Amino acid sequence: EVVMTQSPASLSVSPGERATLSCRARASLGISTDLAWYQQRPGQAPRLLIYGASTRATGIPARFSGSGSGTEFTLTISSLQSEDSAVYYCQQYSNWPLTFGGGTKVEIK
Amino acid sequence: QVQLVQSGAEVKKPGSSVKVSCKASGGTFRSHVISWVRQAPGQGLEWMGGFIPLFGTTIYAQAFQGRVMISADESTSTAYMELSSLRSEDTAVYFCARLFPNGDPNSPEDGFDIWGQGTLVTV
Amino acid sequence: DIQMTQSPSSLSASVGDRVTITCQASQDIGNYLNWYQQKPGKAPKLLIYDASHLETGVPSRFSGSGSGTDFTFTISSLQPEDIATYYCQRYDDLPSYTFGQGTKVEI
Amino acid sequence: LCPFDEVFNATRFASVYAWNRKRISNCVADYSVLYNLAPFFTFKCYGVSPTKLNDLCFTNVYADSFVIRGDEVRQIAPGQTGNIADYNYKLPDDFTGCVIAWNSNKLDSKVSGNYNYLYRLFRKSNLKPFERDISTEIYQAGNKPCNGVAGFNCYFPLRSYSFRPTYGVGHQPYRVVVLSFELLHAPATVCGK
Amino acid sequence: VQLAQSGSELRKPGASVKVSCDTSGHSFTSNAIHWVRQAPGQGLEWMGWINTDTGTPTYAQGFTGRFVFSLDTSARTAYLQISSLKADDTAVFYCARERDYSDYFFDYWGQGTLVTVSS
Prior knowledge:
Distance between the termini of chain A: 36 Å
Order of helices and strands of chain E: EEEEEEEEEE
Region (Integrin-binding motif) (chain D): 69-71
Radius of gyration of chain A: 13 Å
CATH superfamily of chain E: Immunoglobulins
Distance between the termini of chain E: 35 Å
Structural class of chain A: mainly beta
CATH topology of chain E: Immunoglobulin-like
Region (Receptor-binding domain (RBD)) (chain D): 1-193
CATH class of chain E: Mainly Beta
Region (Disordered) (chain D): 121-156
Oligomer: heteropentamer
CATH topology of chain A: Immunoglobulin-like
Radius of gyration of chain E: 14 Å
CATH superfamily of chain A: Immunoglobulins
Order of helices and strands of chain A: EEEEEEEEE
Region (Immunodominant HLA epitope recognized by the CD8+) (chain D): 114-122
Region (Receptor-binding motif) (chain D): 103-174
CATH class of chain A: Mainly Beta
């Protein structure tokens, strides 16, 4: 499989500044823009934010821009509101053990 | 218009061997696996074996494992089932069949499943 | 190996009735089941494939059901041209098939 | 080891005319890991000994992955003719690699019909070996310069496989991975016990 | 973007539990309905997928042998059945379904059901 190490462990970014999420793969040949970003608010089911590296799902605000390719990807949260205090996972839909990420528990100061 | 035709009814004696053919009508013999089904004259159908013309591998039923032998002649679109060691229990109507996943996108008028007409092997 | 016990093996119903035929596998096979019809003296014909769908040209009276092990063959209204024997067949991705004991429907 | 759990189990196998070339190097290439693939898969190869490919090694291993139907997996071999081996993917006659193909009826077949896999049908010529063409120029055989629209003898070259679960073994989707080893002046660094 | 699921179970060790996922509320174009396990404090783990309209499961590495996926008589609702419940098995099992064919990201998630294996 592709063990997807997600860094950092916990983010404490004040509103409405920028929070940078990072999800680094363990693929010798790279995921090649086949990552998916999820957002799990506590006590709630995960929500698909970005499918592929860049393009977002329907109903998503424009502030959840995704970027990166290969073996290093990035989710940038601009104007991080109170509603976004959630755990963020990353999924490779590249190799068939579709491994989810660790989860960077974003916290509001 | 694929029409599977066979050899004909063969009377035999126990201990011998019978080889029965199934000449497919068409140029697409290679695509579809051809499989042989026997039916006892009062009992239900029973699967015997199959020959995949893509790679030549065979899958045999565990009751007929080592008794039957299924081969084919791709240059004339004819599959041969060589049943050996006939007995009193091996009296059946032997169908050649293209069992269910043997449809093709070209000419959908022939269905997904195509059977033969039956060969009555009597001992 | 997988053996499948289709029951009842011999029922009887009048015209315009409902006929239910049940095929029970021994372990999980999924939707991999086909339903046949052998009128006597002829080659079998296919009616239901993948345990729910309908063959082209087959009238919509027949309808299969079931996924796990308990499948079910249903005829909506019996007709005089449906006096036959019905076999349940276990397709696998490697082409190994297992038929059933059969159900003779008598008018 | 080589990553063979990143070529053979990829979720995205491309269509045949746009076969994905993947260069693998710096390994201990163990081909005994392929036992847990599909129950029958064709591991045939040419120019190397299939009982000795774990001891003879190479400067690079190029793996090309695509999806074709079962009727035309025969053409994935040197010295073959057909639609694929002439117009989509041609292997050279000097081939020194392995052709692996397994049935993918579970992954690539929808009951409605899987139209995502396309093959090249008309291209006015043949293909040189290990050359691809992603070109979608409208094919011209008739004597009309009507390239903007379809015509009597003007066709779009790519056509769809239409994979269904109600089809024969010749029309079932066969995922193909063709390893293509090469030996050059560089140190190999692919072999190992 | 919600799929119906079963309620919680306060099960016991060495027992069997059934988890439903009735996805008959939408109109679809895919054929796969995946299963995702979440621990009470840890991250998501992909269990595997049951294939709609052919009924064939496929499991991940650590979720084989005990977990079995199956369908009901209709071709909509899929079942998860855990056999031989252990002590460290309390988890929030999710039912995730794709939006389009050959799109292995999970747009439509379940509501999540929780087994509570204890004594």
